[PDB]
Curated annotation (Swiss-Prot):
The SH3 domain mediates interaction with SMN1. This is Osteoclast-stimulating factor 1. It comes from Homo sapiens. The lineage of its organism: Eukaryota, Metazoa, Chordata, Craniata, Vertebrata. The gene is OSTF1. Residues 1-59 form the SH3 domain. It is found in: Cytoplasm.
């Protein structure tokens, strides 16, 4: 199970065996059992990283796919997927990355997520909202359209007893859902 970090400060390597990590770079580590050196991947390169650097000069990222999706960062989303972050992972509120992509109107992300094996469309979060609820609320009819074509259910109600249809903020979304 991959563990994901953001560099807080630049790491400049002392051996060719070490990665040159810059501030803000994302680090993927799978094996953290060894004492002093861990194997990680950053910027498409794999190498050894001092465990001390990761502890002192990086911050862990609990939901990297969700963050990428939420801010519409397609390059980072693809990187997450490449490093085996699960497409259907749930954050603490029971939301998927797809939910956040739709909440932000990030069609680029939705399309990329739809390339993934067995994408779950119908996850209801803590509040009972699906990605389709968020898309309807967001008001981009073309993203509603994409979700519908991919198989999104329209018969699921949130804690407020609302269907995705009930969330629609414009007639374009309303028409697609009616």
């Amino acid at each position: 199970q991959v563990k994901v970090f953001r560099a807080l400060y630049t790491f400049e390597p002392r051996t060719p065996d070490e990665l040159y990590i810059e501030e803000g770079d994302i680090i993927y580590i799978t094996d953290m059992s060894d004492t002093n050196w861990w194997k990680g991947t950053s910027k498409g390169r794999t190498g050894l990283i001092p465990s001390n650097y990761v502890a002192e000069q990086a911050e862990s990222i609990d939901n990297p796919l969700h963050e990428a999706a939420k801010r519409g960062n397609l390059s980072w989303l693809r990187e997450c997927l490449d490093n085996r972050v699960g497409v259907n992972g749930l954050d603490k509120a029971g939301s998927t990355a797809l939910y956040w992509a739709c909440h932000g109107g990030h069609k680029d992300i939705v399309e990329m997520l739809f390339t993934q094996p067995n994408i779950e469309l119908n996850q209801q979060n803590k509040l009972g909202d699906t990605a389709l609820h968020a898309a309807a609320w967001k008001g981009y009819a073309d993203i509603v359209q994409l979700l519908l074509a991919k198989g999104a259910r329209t018969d699921l109600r949130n804690i407020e007893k609302k269907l995705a249809f009930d969330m629609a903020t414009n007639a374009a979304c309303a028409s697609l859902l009616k």
